[PDB]
């Protein structure tokens, strides 16, 4: 009768053994309470799969040619508009709330489960960004050039910038009276280091890794080479203590 396929998003697929009179596959899958059914002119568990929720939505179910992807969406009662997205492909999901046509709310989940939640999303593409690593957050805005988040210690302001490509730079602002004090810094998006520096001498690096984790090593007190070994920050307290 059918083989079962696994899907992105933790789903299933029940695919026809073979193929109708007009060479299409039967598909049927289950969504937490909703049954979804379509065909596909494809038989491995790609195509196309809609439903109806008790509230009358539509809901329509995508899977990619490869099945590296899936779509799940949700649309108003005649299936016009959308009501929410979410996508899920290698890892990770972006979830769309929508009203209006405009995107009020998006959130990743990348695959190590760390997130970026935007909210009160507007239609110039603004509104409130939050990153949700293991062991702390990071707040602040997004626009439609860029997320910001920022961590404010003393004088001192960290922004981690993230592209709308997804890029990372970092940068440092430090309102400081003095100079013997005062924190500057330079971004290396060779090496996703954020250098920083005090009174002439570098003081730490700062490594914005792949691995959506921040580290931070020391330098000598010549501030000229980098001393023990980088420690994974686990708190937001111990990045405020980097920014001293």
Request: glycine share 8%; aromatic share 2%; proline share 0%.
């Given at each position: 009768?059918?083989?079962?396929?696994?899907?992105?998003?933790?789903?299933?697929?029940?695919?026809?053994?073979?193929?109708?009179?007009?060479?299409?596959?039967?598909?049927?899958?289950?969504?937490?309470?909703?049954?979804?059914?379509?065909?596909?002119?494809?038989?491995?568990?790609?195509?196309?799969?809609?439903?109806?929720?008790?509230?009358?939505?539509?809901?329509?179910?995508?899977?990619?040619?490869?099945?590296?992807?899936?779509?799940?969406?949700?649309?108003?009662?005649?299936?016009?508009?959308?009501?929410?997205?979410?996508?899920?492909?290698?890892?990770?999901?972006?979830?769309?709330?929508?009203?209006?046509?405009?995107?009020?709310?998006?959130?990743?989940?990348?695959?190590?489960?760390?997130?970026?939640?935007?909210?009160?999303?507007?239609?110039?593409?603004?509104?409130k960004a939050k990153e949700?690593?293991?062991?702390y957050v990071l707040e602040g805005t997004?626009?439609?050039?860029?997320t910001t988040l920022v961590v404010k210690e003393g004088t001192v302001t960290l922004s981690k910038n993230?592209?709308?490509?997804?890029?990372?730079?970092v940068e440092l602002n430090d309102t400081d009276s003095?100079?013997?004090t005062k924190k500057t810094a330079?971004?290396?998006?060779?090496?996703?280091?954020l250098?920083i520096?005090?009174?002439?001498?570098?003081?730490?690096?700062l490594?914005?890794?792949?691995?959506?984790?921040i580290?931070v090593?020391?330098?000598?007190?010549?501030?000229?080479?980098?001393?023990?070994?980088?420690?994974?920050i686990?708190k937001l307290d111990e990045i405020k203590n980097a920014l001293k």
């Amino acid at each position: 009768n059918s083989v079962s396929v696994d899907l992105p998003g933790s789903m299933k697929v029940l695919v026809s053994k073979s193929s109708n009179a007009d060479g299409k596959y039967d598909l049927i899958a289950t969504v937490d309470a909703l049954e979804l059914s379509g065909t596909s002119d494809k038989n491995n568990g790609s195509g196309v799969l809609e439903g109806v929720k008790a509230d009358a939505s539509k809901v329509k179910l995508t899977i990619s040619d490869d099945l590296g992807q899936t779509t799940l969406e949700v649309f108003k009662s005649d299936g016009s508009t959308l009501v929410s997205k979410k996508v899920t492909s290698n890892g990770s999901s972006t979830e769309e709330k929508i009203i209006d046509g405009i995107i009020i709310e998006k959130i990743i989940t990348r695959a190590d489960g760390t997130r970026l939640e935007y909210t009160g999303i507007k239609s110039d593409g603004s509104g409130k960004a939050k990153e949700v690593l293991k062991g702390y957050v990071l707040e602040g805005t997004l626009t439609a050039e860029k997320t910001t988040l920022v961590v404010k210690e003393g004088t001192v302001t960290l922004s981690k910038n993230i592209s709308k490509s997804g890029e990372v730079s970092v940068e440092l602002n430090d309102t400081d009276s003095s100079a013997a004090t005062k924190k500057t810094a330079a971004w290396n998006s060779g090496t996703s280091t954020l250098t920083i520096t005090v009174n002439s001498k570098k003081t730490k690096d700062l490594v914005f890794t792949s691995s959506n984790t921040i580290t931070v090593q020391q330098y000598d007190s010549n501030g000229t080479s980098l001393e023990g070994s980088a420690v994974e920050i686990t708190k937001l307290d111990e990045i405020k203590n980097a920014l001293k």
